[PDB]
Every structure is written in structure tokens, then in C-alpha cells.
Amino acid sequence: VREIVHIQAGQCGNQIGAKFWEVISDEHGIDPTGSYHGDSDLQLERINVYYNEATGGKYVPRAILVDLEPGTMDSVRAGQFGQLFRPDNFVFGQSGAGNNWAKGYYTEGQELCESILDVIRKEAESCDCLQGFQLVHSLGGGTGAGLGTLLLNKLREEYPDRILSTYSIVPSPKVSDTVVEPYNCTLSVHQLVESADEVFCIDNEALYDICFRTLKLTTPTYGDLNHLVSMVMSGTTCALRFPGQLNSDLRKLAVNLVPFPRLHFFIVGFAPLTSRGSQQYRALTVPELTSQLFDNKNMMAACDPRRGVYLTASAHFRGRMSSKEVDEQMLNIQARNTSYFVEWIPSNVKSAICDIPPRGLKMAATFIGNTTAFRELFTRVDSQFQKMYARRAFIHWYVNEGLETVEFDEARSNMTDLIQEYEMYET
């Protein structure tokens, strides 16, 4: 009875969420038509976290779908698990996305926001309890980057106690999928820094590298990439759904990992990864999970932890294991590699254990880290923002929508201040 509201916004968020419901429905044992035919009584214990029950044994997820154009909605509507969603929860406009942050935030966002909030209010007030909100969006586009922040601000206005955890995808360092990303990302950061409580950053390039290096995928489609992201989102809330020897929910994670209000951007990872044909050679044990978790190549964000220093880190374990083994391993990784962990915080590594692992695996682990290495990512976008802005260039398409030039200067000022804040605490 710690329900979580899930919101999908934008092209990227909608597809990731679609795979995410397949992952849960398999774990809990729900048919695509919403019938329960599972295999364990434990799956029905706390299914209320993610689902509402319709009279007749039909289970409906707490999902809200948002887009400016119905293009991606129709693809999900034809999906395998498309029948699962509530038909009235589909909210969309009738205008092109525009790929413009100002247009999404100001021009079409205002019209859509009033309907979206009441759709949220139906699900938020329908359940016995509500811990926090779950948002999926990207930071390079116009719909997710703009309208997602607008809904985040409204959510912070109405519900100032709940945890506003969001999952975001950051533009890649080498080749990126939009011309005007530095404008969109810098504007989006200023909203996210103040309004949110947890932000998880995922990079597409690292997902490609992880697929080829470990999974040996010759042709990794977006389906596999969304599958990799879906595991982490399942892992974080698993402590709510199943019993364990040491429970650790969202607010425990926020207090442990966040030492100052603004340093709350996080890197994520998952282990183990089934190499096709090669895992026969590998002996999966708890120390092996730790080796993959703290390996720099498994991180989903292309920021090298070794070039920075750690502040806090957290690991979850799923399955029947020894508690002494877990507490010893966190000790060993912190003692053998001292230089990267700060001094003025002892016991930088948090741990947690849950007895029920996912299907097929015997044990699974999730790694969430916080480090100064994020200054690499913000420096990357700042230089792109700076030099384009000097030429003015694409500004013409944001000014006409009603955005004044002071917003660019304010967004850079806050974003640069965030960079220095990671600089200062390295001492």
C-alpha cells in the first residue's frame, strides 16, 4: 500500500514504458488481457503498488499517457500489451510536436496540462496511499523535455511531500539525434534541479556499448535497449512489492544518497548480463555480482567514475543469499579502492537484500551511484550552448513562440553554478 503513479511523456518515454509493463506483467503473472493466471500467492500480496483491479478479476495499471501528436500512441495501441491500459487515460493534442522546448512548454503545454492533471488526480486520489510519482521522458526533445518539466512543477505544487522520481535520457557525446539539443537540455535542467527529488540519467551510447561488449548483440534494436532500462526501473521499486531481509524504499534511498539538496543526479547499472553462449563459462556468485556492479563498463551513462570521485553509492540484491557476504563485499570494494571515495564520508556504500529475484535468474543486482563525474556531462552541453548562443543561430524558432532572451541567460547561470558545486565539494 505504497502506490506509485506512472506517467509516460514523449516518443522516448512511451516506448520505454510499453516494454516496462511487459516486464512487470510477466513478473506478477498477468495476462495481456489483464487476467491473473500466475504461479505464486506472493505475487498478489502488494500488486496494488502498480495496478488497479477492475471488477471481474481484470487488473488495470496506474498509467497515464501524454503526447502532443497521436503518432506514437497508435503504435502502442497496436502493441501486444496495448489492451492493458485504461482507454480514457490516453491524452493527446492535435498539433505537431515541433521539437521545440518553448512550443511544448508554453504553446501547446498549457492546453494539455489542465486535462492531464485531472487524469492524474483520478488515479492519485483513487488509492489508499501514494508515496511518489514516476515519470519517463528524454531531455533532448521538445515534448518530453518541455512538457515533462511543466507537469513536474505542477506535481510539486499540489503534492509537496511525495517523491518525484523521474527517469531521463541524456544526449549522447559523439553523435546525437537532434540539432537543437543544447538549448532544450539546458532549459530543462533548470526546472529539474529545483522541482524533482531523484533524477536518473541514461545515455544511448553506453547502451549500445553494453550490448556489443557483454551481450554480444550484433543488431541491437531499440527493443533491447528499452529492455535494459526497464530492469533498473523494476529493481528500484522491488523493495516495495516483495519481502526481504533488509527493506529499502525510495525515501531511504533519497536520504542516504543525497548529501546536499542539489547534488541528486544519479548513474544507474544492472547485473548480471547473460552473454549469449558464454555464461556457461561464468560461475555466478555474490562476489561476481559485485565485480560487474562496480565495473566502469556496465554504467549506463558515458561518464567515467574514475575521472571523478564518489560521494554515495547503493546496491540492491535480489534472491536468497548470505547477509555477511553482502556486508563484506561493500567493505572490500571501499577498502581496496580508497582514492575514489571521499574521506569526510565514511561508509560510502549502502546495501540492501531482497529474497525474490526475477524470473530465470537466481540473483540480480542493481547499482545506483552518485559522483562528481557528472561535471563532464554538464561541461559538454555548456560549451555547445555557449558557442551556438553567441552566433544567436536557432534562437529565431524560440523567440517567435514567446520566449525572451533572459531565460537563456538564467538557465546557463544555474547550470554553470551546478557545475561549480560539483567542483567545490571535491575538496
Binding site: 498539433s95 508554453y106 504553446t107 501547446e108 498549457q110 492546453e111 505544487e157 499540489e158 509537496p160 517567435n400 513562440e401 514567446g402 520566449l403 525572451e404 533572459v406 531565460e407
Partner: protein, 161 residues
């Protein structure tokens, strides 16, 4: 001192009330700018009598949504104020809680120190009463001996000198 800190906090919150509608709320929507663009391009042609119609159509739309955003701003300000108000109530709740405990510490230690002396006094007062009872009994026997009596047993002599 806590009351002074709360008063300073209250002053700080209300010091910076904007004199006009802030920037984020200040913008229009699509249906206003589109009508402005068609109005401006109509007047560029020698078709003024239709541009004037578009302007008068767009004015009544800007006038609506501007005051529509005004109510949202006022509601948001009031909701932010109510959050700060419940927080400072919680601050006072902690202060009365901590000093309730601080009062209990003294209220127990002082009563314990008195309780040591209270029983000691009551202990000796009972000892004195029982001691005086023997003296009164011997005096009563000696007084009654004044009119006929018999000799009693004597105490132990020669203890130590």
C-alpha cells in the same frame, strides 16, 4: 529566541512579492500568435479591412487567457504560503517537545534528591519515638515503685574503660 527566528522567517518569505505577473505565467498560447501573424500579413497586402477583423478577433482572446493565467499564479502563491505555514507549526512542535523532555529531567532529579532526605528524616523520627517509649516505661515503673515495689535486674557493668 525561537519566536524571534520565526518572525524573521515570516518577514523573509513575504518581502519579495512580485509587483506584476511573473515571466513564466506571462505568455500567450498558439491561437493568439497565429491570428497576429495573419493580421500582420493581411495588412501588408492592400486588404486592411480583413486585418482589422483579425486584430479585433485576437484581442478578445489575449484578454481571456491573460486573466486565466492570473488566477493560476494567485493559487500557486497561496499554496506555497500554506506549505511554509505548516512547516513553522512543525518547528514549534519540536521546540515544545524537546523542552518538555528537558523539564522532565530536572523534575525527576530534584525529587530524587529530596526523596533521599525525606526517608532518612522519617526513619529517624520513628527511631526516636520507639526510643522514648522505653524511657517512659522505665519512668512509669519507677514512679509506681514509690508506693510498694520490688527490685529489678541491673544492667551489665565492667564493659571497658
Amino acid at each position: 529566541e525561537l519566536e524571534e527566528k520565526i518572525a524573521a522567517e515570516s518577514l523573509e518569505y513575504g518581502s519579495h512579492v512580485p509587483k506584476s505577473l511573473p515571466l513564466e505565467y506571462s505568455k500567450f498560447s498558439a491561437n493568439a500568435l497565429n491570428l497576429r501573424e495573419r493580421q500582420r500579413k493581411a495588412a501588408r497586402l492592400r486588404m486592411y479591412d480583413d486585418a482589422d477583423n483579425f486584430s479585433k478577433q485576437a484581442l478578445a482572446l489575449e484578454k481571456k487567457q491573460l486573466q486565466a493565467q492570473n488566477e493560476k499564479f494567485v493559487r500557486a502563491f497561496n499554496l506555497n504560503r500554506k506549505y511554509l505555514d505548516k512547516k513553522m507549526v512543525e518547528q514549534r512542535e519540536c521546540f515544545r517537545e524537546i523542552w518538555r523532555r528537558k523539564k522532565d529531567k530536572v523534575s525527576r532529579d530534584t525529587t530524587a534528591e529530596l526523596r533521599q532526605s525525606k526517608k532518612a528524616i522519617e526513619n529517624l523520627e520513628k527511631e526516636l519515638a520507639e526510643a522514648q517509649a522505653s524511657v517512659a516505661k522505665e519512668m512509669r515503673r519507677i514512679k509506681l515503685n514509690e508506693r510498694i515495689g520490688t527490685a529489678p535486674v541491673n544492667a551489665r557493668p565492667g564493659a571497658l574503660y
